[PDB]
Amino acid sequence: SHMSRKIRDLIESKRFQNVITAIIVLNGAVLGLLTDTTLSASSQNLLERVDQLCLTIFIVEISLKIYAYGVRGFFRSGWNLFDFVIVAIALMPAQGSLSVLRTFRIFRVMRLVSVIPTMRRVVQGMLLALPGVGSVAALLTVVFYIAAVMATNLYGATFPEWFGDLSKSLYTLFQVMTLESWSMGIVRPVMNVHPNAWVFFIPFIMLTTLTVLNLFIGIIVDAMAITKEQEEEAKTGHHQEPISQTLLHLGDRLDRIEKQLAQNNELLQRQ
Amino acid sequence: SHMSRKIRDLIESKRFQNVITAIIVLNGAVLGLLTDTTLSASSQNLLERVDQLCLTIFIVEISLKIYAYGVRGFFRSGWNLFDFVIVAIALMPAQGSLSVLRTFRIFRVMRLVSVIPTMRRVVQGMLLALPGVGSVAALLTVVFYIAAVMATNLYGATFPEWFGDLSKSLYTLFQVMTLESWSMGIVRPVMNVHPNAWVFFIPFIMLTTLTVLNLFIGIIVDAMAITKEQEEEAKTGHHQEPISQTLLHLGDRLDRIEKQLAQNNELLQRQ
Amino acid sequence: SHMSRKIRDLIESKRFQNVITAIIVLNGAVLGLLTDTTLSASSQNLLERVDQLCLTIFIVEISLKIYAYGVRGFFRSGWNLFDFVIVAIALMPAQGSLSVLRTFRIFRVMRLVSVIPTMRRVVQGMLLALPGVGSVAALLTVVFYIAAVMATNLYGATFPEWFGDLSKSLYTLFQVMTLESWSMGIVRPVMNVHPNAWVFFIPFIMLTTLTVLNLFIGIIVDAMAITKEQEEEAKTGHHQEPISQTLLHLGDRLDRIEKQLAQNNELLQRQ
Amino acid sequence: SHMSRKIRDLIESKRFQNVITAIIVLNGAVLGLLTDTTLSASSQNLLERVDQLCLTIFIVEISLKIYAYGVRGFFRSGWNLFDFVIVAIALMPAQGSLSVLRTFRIFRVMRLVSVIPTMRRVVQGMLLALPGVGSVAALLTVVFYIAAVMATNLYGATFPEWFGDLSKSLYTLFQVMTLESWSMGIVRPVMNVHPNAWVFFIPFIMLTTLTVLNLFIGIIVDAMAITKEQEEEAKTGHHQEPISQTLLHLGDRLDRIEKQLAQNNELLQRQ
Numbered sequence A, B, C, D: 001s002h003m004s005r006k007i008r009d010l011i012e013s014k015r016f017q018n019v020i021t022a023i024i025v026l027n028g029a030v031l032g033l034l035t036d037t038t039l040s041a042s043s044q045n046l047l048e049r050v051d052q053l054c055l056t057i058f059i060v061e062i063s064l065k066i067y068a069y070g071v072r073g074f075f076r077s078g079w080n081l082f083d084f085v086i087v088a089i090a091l092m093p094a095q096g097s098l099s100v101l102r103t104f105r106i107f108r109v110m111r112l113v114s115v116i117p118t119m120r121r122v123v124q125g126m127l128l129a130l131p132g133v134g135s136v137a138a139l140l141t142v143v144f145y146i147a148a149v150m151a152t153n154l155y156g157a158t159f160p161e162w163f164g165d166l167s168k169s170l171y172t173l174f175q176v177m178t179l180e181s182w183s184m185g186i187v188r189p190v191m192n193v194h195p196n197a198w199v200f201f202i203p204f205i206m207l208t209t210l211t212v213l214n215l216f217i218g219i220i221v222d223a224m225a226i227t228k229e230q231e232e233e234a235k236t237g238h239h240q241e242p243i244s245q246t247l248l249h250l251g252d253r254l255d256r257i258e259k260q261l262a263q264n265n266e267l268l269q270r271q
């Protein structure tokens, strides 16, 4: 069909992307103005209608995309499903979920990420970098769980606001890890009752700050190489060898070329 | 002309650079002494005249440079325009701009950076490294904007000093990100009214600290390679291949040399 | 023997690993529920019996492993000795050691690390990375010891809570290093009595934060390469050349191939 | 001479190094015990004599080294001059310097670094890494000086404890940079009088934390490669090409080998 063809040409254009980006910024700005409690009844009603206009433009946009690519074709992309959910969640007459309320209309600004390709690639790098740090994130989870059970048993009876239960302990252990008032606010007061409390919190700080930094460095380094390798694949179209694989087999590739040079020289000297 | 030639020879000399560097340090030191409110009327007038002398030396310096290189030639360098603005801004009888006042004469010490070539190269590395982190900086901007709108709507009515409006929220979210009294000062008090506030601030901390570190690591790594590659171009004069490009095509260059070795060996065995 | 053979086949299976992992999570969860002081007598007795069941399953598991591999074969692995100690420590009718009490049954959750191979490899990377940072860790130890002796002599008489003895000084120096209330809580108050105290604490902060970061970066970078090289050895089975050795001899390997190319070209031109 | 020869053989032995290391630890431990104000007159006199014994052993050690290597030969090493000063400074009957007092006998423990070769190499890596970060350290110095002059002029009259003079401003700007109570303790109070103070402190934090991290990453990366390259030179004895030089010329070395392969193949096909 010619109708689905020219609609895709329109959707894939730079101006269409710019119009949709402009509407996201406009929706974002109206939601920001609506945080102002002093605004008049007319000013609020006006901005709410501008929010309604922005929302309807997105319904036209998504419906135009579903028709032009097909239900299966549109939903083949994770970015499209995200775009679909962000907009479709607004058209909901009552929902039965384990969430508070959908008053967070501002999450629509997250579409700037999906609509801008350079920003889409950054998040892509970060998400693809997550599986590779799963074991470190799990190790940190185990350290926190063990630590929380210990802290609850040791300090909960004497310090109930900070360690009274497992939930309170997880919260103040996260605070200790971020180094936030860990000594003047938590451990110096706890040491006044339990003088050897530093045997618990100092190794806890040393271990968690090292593991967290490991988790962050792991993500930053992979995400940086993934984003870079994706660009070399979104230019040449050829598959890019992962930098780690190049580095692992570098020595192997060097001795093979060395040995092939000597045997070629061995046959060259005697002809 | 012989006048413009010998003036360039003088300007490009090591001693001329040292004289101008000495005057910048002297101007910087007099402005530092002038922060002392206890000083006598004579001492203040004296230092203000030494500041005036330093300023006039810079007017001679820039005018000497404009004549020796030509208006177009001088203004071709961004460092020269910066040097021009820093000095020309002082000779201003009233200005109509969206700024407070030009009492910040101390910004003249920033000329140490433009006048010292090693320091000029460091800032150059840092500035050239900025475009490459634009998408991460934009992602962090979007996270802050979404977060500020949420925090204003959720906590502004109960916590007006910290979240009363969009501006107050952006400020305390920047504080939370820097881990400054985030729990003892902000979130433990907010949890006394909103017990699930940690569902907001803990993921906000996790996401922003990771993104900020990504932004900083990105800048530090590029700036380091740019400064290094600039030096290999300011020695040999030959263009230096970016380290990333060397790394991306390393595997490709290795299999090409491997394949050329085997085909050469294939023709060598049968002659 | 056929009995020891089929028992090893069972132990090395994926389902056996999953059953033992399930029991660790179950034991971990019951120990977490037991931190709740409000629980009834029946609820506590019940969970204590579920803890007892979990413990006995581990005694069956280890005994099954000792028989199937032999005492020497089982104890050949450091992970097995760790698994043995974690379980065998529970079956102890009074012990004479320089420890408080074995109420930390929650340390049994650390078995998730030894039982899950990806998690076992992460800790392995981290432990093997420790010898290489021993000199930096020793340098930081020497800085802390010298600093503590100084701080005790200088500030102990005027500030006994923070510097009264060597132990109190080591503790507040660790706090200063983590940047926790170092100025508003410790150094601004100390400067009210000793105005040049900043000559001590600012260089102490500068030196220790740099050394700690060196210690952490050192561990993170090695552990990352060790874990990666271990995987290339737990796939191909061939020994992986350490990335540092590849990098050190890279220039050497390149000039050797360059020189062999020119001499081959020298003999090729004249035949 | 045979006397100077066998004395060098003794000095260069492992046991001699161990004896001197034992005496440093012993001296360090006695100085630590002497921080205890509760000690009796006899206990103090005893430890002071053990300190005196340790000091005399070092005088024998250095004098033995000066004779065995010669005045010029001994003083040729920077580590020896350091060892000489640390010991010779103790034998001083009154000194006229811009220092407080030589009560810091504990600085003798810094000899553990010079006496242990692995620890000596770590400090060597760190010291040799300093010239390369001189421009970044200078940039950070200029930012602090400009910032201190601004802060004194803007906030000194309203906030004299924190910004009353140039010295007070440098101190609280260093505190702000370390993120220590920067908002709850300094900027929220300053904003109550100067509402746009965040325009000053937020860009100051952003710029200084980035520059400091640049300074630290710069030192850690060079020191790590220097220590590594020094070891490859203290094993093979051959000069090690700096990793940066290997990386810069990697692309250049690859295209030269590529071009030499094609021209060799061009002559091989037609013989």
Ligand SMILES: CC/C(=C(/c1ccc(O)cc1)c1ccc(OCCNC)cc1)c1ccccc1
Pocket (backbone or CB within 6 Å): A132, A133, A217, A218, A219, A221, A222, A243, A244, A245, A247, A248, C221, C224, C225, C228, C243, C244
């Ligand atoms: C720190 C980055 C790094 C890595 C590397 C080391 C040896 C190789 O053969 C290939 C890659 C590296 C890079 C990324 C890694 O994973 C990131 C997320 N997993 C934690 C793991 C290792 C490295 C380490 C030392 C020298 C050169 C590169």
Ligand SMILES: CC/C(=C(/c1ccc(O)cc1)c1ccc(OCCNC)cc1)c1ccccc1
Pocket (backbone or CB within 6 Å): A221, A224, A225, A228, A243, A244, B132, B133, B217, B218, B219, B221, B222, B243, B244, B245, B247, B248
């Ligand atoms: C962390 C530096 C790094 C990089 C790299 C990875 C693969 C390549 O083919 C070329 C460069 C790298 C270096 C700088 C980068 O950009 C810095 C600013 N953008 C966020 C992005 C990636 C890297 C990652 C893993 C192993 C070796 C180098």
Ligand SMILES: CC/C(=C(/c1ccc(O)cc1)c1ccc(OCCNC)cc1)c1ccccc1
Pocket (backbone or CB within 6 Å): C132, C133, C217, C218, C219, C221, C222, C243, C244, C245, C247, C248, D221, D224, D225, D228, D243, D244
């Ligand atoms: C930061 C990692 C690194 C390293 C390197 C530098 C030169 C070499 O010939 C081989 C390895 C490196 C990697 C890990 C090191 O040890 C980690 C634990 N010891 C402190 C030490 C150095 C490096 C530094 C500069 C460029 C490329 C890699």
Ligand SMILES: CC/C(=C(/c1ccc(O)cc1)c1ccc(OCCNC)cc1)c1ccccc1
Pocket (backbone or CB within 6 Å): B221, B224, B225, B228, B243, B244, D132, D133, D217, D218, D219, D221, D222, D243, D244, D245, D247, D248
């Ligand atoms: C971060 C280390 C690094 C570096 C590098 C980049 C390109 C080269 O041709 C040679 C070395 C590097 C390593 C150390 C440097 O100096 C450390 C102290 N000066 C600030 C500067 C740059 C680098 C950056 C990107 C990819 C691979 C290595």
Ligand SMILES: CC/C(=C(\c1ccc(O)cc1)c1ccc(OCCNC)cc1)c1ccccc1
Pocket (backbone or CB within 6 Å): A128, A129, A131, A132, A133, A134, A135, A221, A222, A223, A225, A226, A229, A242, A243, A244, C118
């Ligand atoms: C090259 C991109 C990449 C990886 C990479 C990124 C930066 C580096 O400096 C080195 C390796 C990568 C990241 C993590 C990996 O394993 C982590 C261990 N698994 C638990 C394996 C490969 C990768 C490869 C396949 C899938 C996802 C990421």
Ligand SMILES: CC/C(=C(\c1ccc(O)cc1)c1ccc(OCCNC)cc1)c1ccccc1
Pocket (backbone or CB within 6 Å): A118, B128, B129, B131, B132, B133, B134, B135, B221, B222, B223, B225, B226, B229, B242, B243, B244
């Ligand atoms: C080699 C200098 C360089 C870059 C570089 C610096 C250090 C590395 O370890 C790897 C790459 C660089 C930096 C960032 C780049 O892309 C970031 C993604 N764009 C949003 C691409 C290249 C660069 C190249 C062209 C223009 C500006 C910087």
Ligand SMILES: CC/C(=C(\c1ccc(O)cc1)c1ccc(OCCNC)cc1)c1ccccc1
Pocket (backbone or CB within 6 Å): C128, C129, C131, C132, C133, C134, C135, C221, C222, C223, C225, C226, C229, C242, C243, C244, D118
């Ligand atoms: C390759 C794994 C490895 C090392 C390594 C990891 C990551 C890198 O980027 C560069 C080197 C390593 C780590 C530390 C080493 O020496 C530190 C100085 N000794 C005090 C020597 C080698 C190693 C080698 C042998 C035993 C243990 C670790």
Ligand SMILES: CC/C(=C(\c1ccc(O)cc1)c1ccc(OCCNC)cc1)c1ccccc1
Pocket (backbone or CB within 6 Å): B118, D128, D129, D131, D132, D133, D134, D135, D221, D222, D223, D225, D226, D229, D242, D243, D244
């Ligand atoms: C290889 C050791 C080295 C350097 C190095 C260390 C680690 C790397 O990843 C890349 C380079 C080094 C460090 C800093 C350099 O320049 C910084 C800019 N000068 C202001 C130049 C070279 C060096 C070289 C000569 C003297 C001192 C240090």
Ligand code: NA
Pocket (backbone or CB within 6 Å): A178, A179, B178, B179, C178, C179, D178, D179
């Ligand atoms: Na901090």
Ligand code: NA
Pocket (backbone or CB within 6 Å): A180, A181, B180, B181, C180, C181, D180, D181
């Ligand atoms: Na704090």
Ligand code: NA
Pocket (backbone or CB within 6 Å): A179, A180, A181, B179, B180, B181, C179, C180, C181, D179, D180, D181
């Ligand atoms: Na803090």
